[PDB]
C-alpha cells in the first residue's frame, strides 16, 4: 500500500499474488470442508437477532469460553420443502472456506435431527439497514467508506469464482470498529459460467435476473450501484409497494438522482446501473479497476481500507458483552429437536 500510494498501478503484481495465495487457501477448504465442529448443548441461546424464511439467527453464549456468537438455525424440512437444499449446502461450504476482513467469520457448524446450525462471530453493531433508516441517508464520504469495502469484497469473492447475489443493507453488519461484515451467504455460489436462478432481493435484482436471461457476476456490480444509491439517497433507485412494480422500473433502467448527488456519484451510478452488459462497470475489459479508478473513489486508499486503517464515520454504541441494543426485537420460539432424523441423506455433506 505505500507503492500504490507512491506509484498507482505499481501494486498490481502484488495484488495478483495476494489473490493467488488467497485462492490456494480457499481451495483447500472448498475441497475438504470442515464439518461437525460443535454441538447444540455447548451454547446458551439468549435472544433472536433476526428471523428469515428457514429459521432465525440467535445471539448465543459459548458455555465453556464465555464468548458470544451469532447462530443461524435452519429447519431441514422447510429447506427441502422450498427446494433450497443446494443453496443451503452452497452457503455453508462457501462461508467455511472464505477469509477476508469484511466477511463474517464462521466459527463452527453442525446439524442435528431437525436443524442445520452455523455459528458465526457476533457482530454487535447491528445491520447497516437500521442505522441507514434511522439517520435517513449517509453523506457521500460515509457511503463511500462502506462502498469501498464492498468493492474489495467482491474483488476477493469474484476472484474465487464466487457470486454473492444478496447485497443489501440488511445483510451488512457494522462491527465494533465501524467497518462492514457481510453476512448471509444463502445465495452465494461457485460458478465459472453463467447461471440462471431467480434469487436475491427485489430492489437489488439486475435486469438480466428479472428477465430470465442467464447471468454472471455482473449482477453483483449492479447490486453495488443499488446499494450506493440507497445509502446516499436514503431510498432505493427502484421502489414501489409490490415487487412487480419494482421489476418494471428496473428493466426500464431509467434512474433519477437526488439533486444533492455529486456529479461523480451520478456518473458512477449510471455506469453501475447500466442495463447493457457490454457497458456495465465491473464487467468491462478492465474489470474492477474501472470502479476503483473512478473519480468518485479518487480519495479512497484501497489498501488502507483493506488494512482497516481508515477512521470510520461512526462506531456503534456498545454497552458490553452480549448487548443487543443495535438490533430489533423478534418473537421468540422454542427450538424443538425431533427424536427422528429428518432429511439425513439430503444434508449428508453439511
Amino acid at each position: 500500500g505505500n507503492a500504490a500510494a507512491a506509484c498507482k498501478g505499481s501494486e498490481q503484481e502484488s495484488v495478483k499474488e495476494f489473490l493467488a495465495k488467497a485462492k490456494e487457501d480457499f481451495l483447500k477448504k472448498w475441497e475438504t470442508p470442515s464439518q461437525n465442529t460443535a454441538q447444540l448443548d455447548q451454547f446458551d441461546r439468549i435472544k433472536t437477532l433476526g428471523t428469515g424464511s428457514f429459521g432465525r439467527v440467535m445471539l448465543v453464549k459459548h458455555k465453556e469460553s464465555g464468548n458470544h456468537y451469532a447462530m443461524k438455525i435452519l429447519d431441514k424440512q422447510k429447506v427441502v420443502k422450498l427446494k433450497q437444499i443446494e443453496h443451503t449446502l452452497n452457503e455453508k461450504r462457501i462461508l467455511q472456506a472464505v477469509n477476508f476482513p469484511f466477511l463474517v467469520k464462521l466459527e463452527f457448524s453442525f446439524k442435528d435431527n431437525s436443524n442445520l446450525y452455523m455459528v458465526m462471530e457476533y457482530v454487535a453493531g447491528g445491520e447497516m439497514f437500521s442505522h441507514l433508516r434511522r439517520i435517513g441517508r449517509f453523506s457521500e464520504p460515509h457511503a463511500r467508506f462502506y462502498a469501498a469495502q464492498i468493492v474489495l469484497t467482491f474483488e476477493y469473492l469474484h476472484s474465487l469464482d464466487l457470486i454473492y447475489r444478496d447485497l443489501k443493507p440488511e445483510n451488512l453488519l457494522i462491527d465494533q470498529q465501524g467497518y462492514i461484515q457481510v453476512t448471509d451467504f444463502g445465495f452465494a455460489k461457485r460458478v465459472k459460467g453463467r447461471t440462471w436462478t431467480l434469487c436475491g432481493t427485489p430492489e437489488y435484482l439486475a435486469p438480466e435476473i428479472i428477465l430470465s436471461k442467464g447471468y454472471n457476476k455482473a449482477v453483483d456490480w449492479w447490486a453495488l450501484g443499488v446499494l450506493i444509491y440507497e445509502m446516499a439517497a436514503g431510498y432505493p433507485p427502484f421502489f414501489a409497494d409490490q415487487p412487480i412494480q419494482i421489476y418494471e422500473k428496473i428493466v426500464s433502467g431509467k434512474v433519477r438522482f437526488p439533486s444533492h448527488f455529486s456529479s461523480d456519484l451520478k456518473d458512477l451510478l449510471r455506469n453501475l446501473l447500466q442495463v447493457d452488459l457490454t457497458k456495465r462497470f465491473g464487467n468491462l475489459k478492465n474489470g474492477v479497476n474501472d470502479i476503483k479508478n473512478h473519480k468518485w473513489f479518487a480519495t479512497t486508499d484501497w489498501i488502507a481500507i483493506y488494512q482497516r486503517k481508515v477512521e470510520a464515520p461512526f462506531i456503534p454504541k456498545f454497552k458490553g458483552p452480549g448487548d443487543t441494543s443495535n438490533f430489533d426485537d423478534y418473537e421468540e420460539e422454542e427450538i424443538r429437536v425431533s427424536i427422528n432424523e429428518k432429511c439425513g441423506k439430503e444434508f449428508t455433506e453439511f
Partner: peptide, 20 residues
C-alpha cells in the same frame, strides 16, 4: 417528495430475500 413517497410505501422495513 421522493423521500415522502418512499416513507409512505409498503417496503421501508427489512426486506426478505426471494427465490422460486
Amino acid at each position: 417528495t421522493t423521500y415522502a413517497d418512499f416513507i409512505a410505501s409498503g417496503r421501508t422495513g427489512r426486506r426478505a430475500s426471494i427465490h422460486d
